[PDB]
Paper text:
Sulfur oxygenase reductases (SORs) are present in thermophilic and mesophilic archaea and bacteria, and catalyze oxygen-dependent oxygenation and disproportionation of elemental sulfur. SOR has a hollow, spherical homo-24-mer structure and reactions take place at active sites inside the chamber. Here, we report the biochemical and structural characterizations of SORs from the thermoacidophilic archaeon Sulfurisphaera tokodaii (StSOR) and present high-resolution structures determined by X-ray crystallography and cryogenic electron microscopy (cryo-EM). Each monomer has an 8-stranded β barrel core surrounded by 10 α helices.
The cryo-EM structure was determined at 2.24 Å resolution using an instrument operating at 200 kV. The cryo-EM analysis was conducted with octahedral symmetry from ab initio 3D reconstruction to the final 3D refinement and model reconstruction. The reconstructed cryo-EM structure consisted of 24 identical polypeptides with residues from Pro2 to Leu311. The overall cryo-EM structure of StSOR was almost the same as determined by the crystal structure. The ligands were similarly located as those of the crystal structure, except that Wat2 was not observed. The CheckMyMetal server indicated trigonal bipyramidal 5-coordination with an outlier nVECSUM of 0.26 and the distances between the iron atom and the ligands were slightly greater than those in the crystal structure. The cryo-EM maps around Cys31 and Cys104 exhibited different features compared with the crystal structure, while Cys101 was also observed as a non-flexible free thiol. The map around Cys31 is extended with a branch. The lengths of the extensions toward the iron and Cys104 are ~4.0 Å and ~3.4 Å, respectively at a 0.0435 (4.5σ) contour level. These lengths correspond to approximately two disulfide bonds (2.05 Å for each), thus implying formation of a persulfide, trisulfide, or branched oligosulfides. On the other hand, chimneys were determined with lower local resolution than inside the molecule in the cryo-EM structure, and the map of the side chains are more ambiguous.
Author numbering:
A (entry chain J), B (entry chain A), C (entry chain K), D (entry chain V): 2 to 311
C-alpha cells in the first residue's frame, strides 16, 4: 500500500563534528523508531545543491555542498498510517528527545516535521549493481519483463530532486492530474529512477519540538536531555496544516546531469512543456527544486509500497 | 554437498613485510594443502574493521585497517570431511610447519584453527562482472531464471561480515532455526551476496601448533623449521570442542554500506527484528561482527557446494 | 582467605582521549563497586606486550605499547564470594551502565568479564621502597624473618605475566599440581614478586553487557546511558562456563628482563623444565603470555588474602 | 575457420619516445599489412610482467612495467594461410622495411617472427560494456542462450597470459590432448575470457630481417631505409622450425587477480591439477608465463575465427 511520510527537516553546521552525528545518533533514532510496528522504513537526505534553472537562481549550483557552512537534512520516515508516527513519538518521547539533543550543538534551524500523504508513487525496489541478475531473472520467470524497473542504487549512489510546490486554493485537482502526467513523462528520460508526489496533511508537534509553555522551558533548561519535558502540546498534527496546499514532487535520478536534463524536459521538450504548463498555472509559489543526496536508507519501505521484495 | 571448514586465525603485524608474506607464502600453503584429494577450496580474509552498531563499539569502524598496527587473518579451507583436514596436516607436516615459520617474525597471536560444520549455506558461484552474460545465459537455457544468483565478485571486491555467536546449552536448536530465517530475510537486502552458518565442532591441534611437551620445545628451538618437531599431540580435534556452542554467521555484502544497512535490518526493520530477537534470546555472548576482506580465494569451493560450475 | 576474581576485559583505542578515561571514569567505577561489602579490592592492567618465546610470536615484543593502535585492558576485581560480584552488578546497574558507556566511543571489543577462583596464591603485600623498613621491622619483631616478602612496588612499577592455559578434560588435576610446582620454582628467580593461579568458573552476564533481546536493543538505543535497560539476562554466570577448562597463570616481576629470564626458566633451566613439561602435556591451548602493566591498584586486596596489613 | 598466427617479437626501450612509435608507426604497419586479402586481423601486446608462481621467479611481478628499462612486444597478425603472410612480406617489402627502421633507435633485440598454427581456440568476440545488450539479445533471438560468451573488453581492458611450453619429441599428442582439457577447465574460473593453443610451424625470414650476406649488409648500411635491401633469404619459413616443438598457451583474463588465481588452478585445484600434471610430464622446458597487455587490436580476427560478427 501507499505509506505516509514524515519529513524531518533540520539545518545543521557543515563541520566534521556533524558528520560524526550521522553515524553515532542517526542509527539510534532509526532503532528507537523501529520499536513501532507501523514503521515501514526511512530515507535520509543531505541537500547538496539547488537546480539553478539557467540563471533563475544563478548563485546556486547542483553540487555546492563543499562550500556551504550549513547542511539541510531531510529525514523521511515511512508509516502505515500517520497516526502511527504520532503514537511513536509519544510512546518513545524520552529516548527520542535525548537523541535529538545530542545534535543540539550543531543545530541551526529546526526540527520541523511536516506530515505527508503519497498522492502518486512510481518508486521501484532499490537494487545494487550486483543484484540486477536476480531482479531481471525473477521478472522474466514471472512473465513480467515489461515491468522491469531501472537499477536504483542505494546509499548515496543517486540524487533526489526535492520539488516544492504551493498550489492555489481550488486548483489542487488540476495540480495532481498534470503533475502525475509530468512524472509519467519522466519515464522516458535517461537516468530517471522513479518519482512520487507528496501532499502535506499536517505537522508533527513532538517531531518539531513544539510543546506548551511549560514544555518549551524544560527544553531550554535541560542538561543534555536528562530532564525530560512532559510531552504536552497545544495542537495535534492536522491542526497545523498549511494553507494553501503544499506539495513535494520527489524525483530520483542516477546523477545530477540526468537530473538537470531530465527535469529540464519541462522547459526544453515541447510535448512535456505543455503538460507542465498546466502545473505552473496552479502555483502560488514554486517550483523550487533542491538537490538531495540519499546517504542513509531503510530501502525496505519500497518493499511495503510495491508489495514485493527482492 | 556441504563441505567442512577449517578457519585458521592469526594476528600478524601490519607492515609492508607482512604483505610480502601474502604473496610469497600464502600460495605455497595452498599448493601443499591441494596435495590432499579432500581439499575443495579456500577463502582467505583480512579483517578490515568491526561493525560498531551505533556506539556499542564506538571506537571501532567498518574500515579501520589503515590505522591498525596488527592484522587479523581468517584463512578458510574447505574439506569434504573434517578428517581430511587432520589427515592433510599429518601427512604434510614438514612442509606446512616450515611455511608457517616463514611468517614467524610477523606473527603476534596464533595460529588457532577451529573446525566448523556448515549448518546452512546460501553461497552462490563467484562471477566477475565480465562473466554475468554466461551466468544468466546458462540459467535461462536451463529454465532456472528464478534462481539466478547475484554477481559475487571474487578477489577483494566484496566484504564479509564475520558474526560470532556463543549459544547457551540447550538453545542450539532455537538458534539454528531463527538464524536461518534471518539469513533468508537478508535475501531482500540490497547488496546481499549470500550467507552461511558455521558450527564449531573442534580445534585442529596441528593447525594450532599444539604439540606435546617435546614437540612444543622443538617448535621454540628450531632454526627456520629445518628441525621438524615430531607431530605428536595430546588430543584430537573433537577433544577440544568449546562449550557452550560457538557459531559463526558468515554473510557477504557488495560493500560496507550494504553490509551496515543490510545487517542493520535486525535492528531497524521491524519484521526482521522479531525474527532476530529469537536469536538474541539464545546467546550467552554476542553478536560481535568483524568486517573481513576476502583477498585470496579458491572460488571453486562453491562449485563443490552448489554441485555446478560456471 | 582466598577471594574470587572478576577480570573485565576490554579493547579500547590507543589515543590521548582514552587515557583521560583512565582517570575520569576508572575511579568512579571503583567507587560504585565499593558500595558492596564483599568487594575487597582491585588491580587494573594495560597490556604492554607479549612474550615472544624466541621467534614463536616473533612479531610481538614485551614492550610494544607505543606502537599499537588499540589497548587491551584487564581490570581485576576481588570478591569475598563470586555471588557478591553478581549482586553488586544488579544493585548498581544504572550507575555502572552509565559509567561504562562513557568509554563507548573508545571501545573496540568487549566488555567480557569471566569469573575466576584462586587455586593457588603467593601474593605478598604491596610495599613502596619507602616502606620496607616497616616491613622488615615488623617481621623481625614477630620472629618471621624467614617469611619476609620481596618489595612489590604498586602503581605501575612492576610487570605482570598473564599466562593463558586451556587444559584438556580430565587433566585439570595434573595441571594444578605441576603449575603450582612451577610457581614455587619461580621463587628462586630474581625479580619474582609473586604469583597466583586462576581457574575460570563462569562469565558475568551484566559485566559483559549480555542481556536478553529487549535489553540488548536498549543498550544500542540509549543516549549516553540515560535510558537504562532492564537488567534481565538469559543466563547466570555458571551457565557460561567454558569447557575445556581455562586457567590464568598470573605472575608478577620487577621488570620485563626479570620476566623474560624468569619465565624462561621453564625452557632453559633443566630442573624447572621437567616440572613444566607436565603442565605442557595437559594443554589443548597455550601457553600464550601477555605482558601487563598494573597502573591503577586497590592493593588492600592482598591484605584480605594474606590476613595481615602493613 | 582457424587462422594462422605470426607473432612478431621485439624488445624496445621503455621511454616516452617508444610510446610515440606505438601511435605513429604501428598503425602504418597494420595498414600496409591490410593490403593483402589473406590478412584477417591483429592483436598487439606489451609485456607487463611475469607470473611468479610463488617464489619460483620471485624477482618478477605480474605488474612490473613501470620499473622496467625495456619493453617486450608481441604483435600477433592473423592469416587465412601462413603463406599469405610470407607473400605479404615479399610484396610489401620496401614499405615494411622502412616502417620497421623507424623503430630502430629504440630496438634492443629482434625482430623475431615465429609462425604458429592454432591447435585449439575458444576465443569469443570482443565486446565493450556498452555492447552486451546487443550480444545477449542476438543470442537469445537465435536460441543460443547456452553459448553466450563472457564480455571480453578490447583495447587494454584485459590481460593475456603468454604460456611458453617446449614439448619432448613424441609427446606432442599427449600435450595437445591435456592442454585442451586444461583450457576447458579454465571455463569455470572467474574472469576467464577465452584461450587458444598455438603450435610453432616456422619462422618468417623477412619478418625477422634475416637475409643473405648481401641483404644483411644493406640493412646495416642504409640511411633510414631509403636504400632497400634485395629481399633474398637463404631459407623459407618451415626450414627454421624449432625442434623440440614449441607451444604457446594463450589465455585471456579480465584482470591480473583473475589470471593469478585462474591459472593457479593447475596448482591449487586438485581436479585440474591432475589434468595439468599430464601436460607437465611432456615438457622439456616450461611453463614460463608472461603477462601481456593487449593495447592495439584488430578484433575482427575473432569474427573470422567464430564465423559470426556482432
Ligand atoms: Fe518523526
Ligand atoms: Fe589447516
Ligand atoms: Fe564486574
Ligand atoms: Fe609479419
Amino acid at each position: 500500500p501507499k505509506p505516509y511520510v514524515a519529513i524531518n527537516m533540520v539545518e545543521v553546521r557543515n563541520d566534521p563534528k556533524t558528520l560524526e552525528l550521522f553515524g553515532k545518533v542517526g542509527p539510534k533514532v532509526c532503532m528507537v523508531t523501529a520499536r513501532h510496528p507501523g514503521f515501514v522504513g526511512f530515507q535520509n537526505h543531505v541537500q547538496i545543491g539547488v537546480v539553478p534553472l539557467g540563471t533563475r537562481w544563478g548563485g546556486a549550483k547542483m553540487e555546492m555542498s563543499q562550500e556551504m557552512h550549513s547542511l539541510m537534512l531531510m529525514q523521511y520516515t515511512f508509516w502505515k498510517n500517520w497516526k502511527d508516527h504520532e503514537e511513536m513519538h509519544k510512546q518513545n518521547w524520552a529516548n527520542l528527545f535525548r537523541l535529538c539533543l545530542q545534535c543540539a550543538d550543531q543545530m541551526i534551524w529546526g526540527p520541523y516535521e511536516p506530515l505527508y500523504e503519497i498522492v502518486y508513487a512510481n518508486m521501484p525496489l532499490n537494487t545494487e549493481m550486483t543484484d540486477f541478475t536476480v531482479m531481471v531473472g525473477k521478472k522474466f520467470a514471472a512473465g513480467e519483463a515489461v515491468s522491469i524497473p531501472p537499477i536504483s542504487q542505494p546509499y548515496g549512489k543517486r540524487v533526489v530532486a526535492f520539488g516544492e510546490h504551493i498550489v492555489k486554493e481550488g486548483l489542487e485537482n488540476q495540480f495532481e492530474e498534470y503533475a502525475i502526467k509530468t512524472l509519467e513523462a519522466f519515464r522516458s528520460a535517461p537516468g530517471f529512477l522513479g518519482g512520487m508526489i507528496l501532499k502535506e496533511i499536517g505537522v508533527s508537534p513532538l517531531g518539531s519540538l513544539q510543546l506548551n509553555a511549560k514544555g518549551f522551558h524544560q527544553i531550554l533548561e535541560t542538561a543534555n536531555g536528562m530532564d525530560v519535558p512532559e510531552p504536552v502540546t497545544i495542537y495535534e498534527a492536522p491542526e497545523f496544516r498549511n494553507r494553501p496546499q503544499r506539495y513535494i514532487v520527489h524525483t530520483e535520478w542516477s546523477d545530477t546531469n540526468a537530473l538537470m536534463f531530465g527535469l529540464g524536459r519541462v522547459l526544453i521538450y515541447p510535448e512535456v512543456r505543455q503538460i507542465h504548463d498546466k502545473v505552473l498555472d496552479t502555483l502560488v509559489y514554486g517550483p523550487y527544486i533542491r538537490v538531495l543526496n540519499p546517504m542513509m536508507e531503510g530501502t525496505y519501505w519500497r518493499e511495503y509500497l510495491n508489495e514485493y521484495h527482492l
